[PDB]
Design a protein around this ligand. Structure first.
Ligand SMILES: O=C(/C=C/N1C[C@H]2C[C@@H]1CN2c1ccccn1)c1ccccc1O
Ligand SMILES: [Zn+2]
Length: 110
């Protein structure tokens, strides 16, 4: 109950985060392209995950700890770094979002 609320607060912080230029960094990460739209993603990435899926997993009580939530957020960001070119905006945004997650978890949970 309190855990579910901690998780929703943390993920909401990550999703709503805007950089100093006003850009909501999460936007591209909410929903993966389909298999038909981007078959090469699914050829490369073994364990696809997006923020929509993480929200599903929170809603359905699938993460039993903040550690388990963190593992999926880090997976998402790792997949983004794997697929996208180093130095691309999406690659760089995924690094920022890792930090935003860790700060949100420090702030909300401690
Ligand atoms: O890498 C991810 C997405 C990369 N895409 C999304 C945009 C930019 C790049 C190529 N894109 C396409 C390509 C085809 C159709 C729709 N979007 C990604 C998205 C959600 C969660 C994890 C991810 O790695
Ligand atoms: Zn429920």
């Amino acid at each position: 109950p309190k855990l579910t609320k901690q998780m929703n607060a943390i993920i909401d912080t990550v999703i709503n985060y805007k950089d100093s230029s006003g850009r909501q960094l999460s936007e591209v990460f909410i929903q993966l392209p389909s298999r038909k739209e981007l078959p090469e993603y699914y050829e490369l990435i073994r364990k696809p995950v997006d923020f929509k899926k993480i929200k599903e997993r929170i809603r359905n009580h699938k993460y039993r700890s903040l550690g388990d939530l963190e593992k999926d957020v880090m997976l998402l960001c790792h997949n983004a770094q794997t697929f996208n070119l180093e130095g691309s905006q999406i690659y760089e945004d995924s690094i920022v979002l890792q930090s935003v997650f860790k700060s949100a978890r420090q702030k909300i949970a401690k």
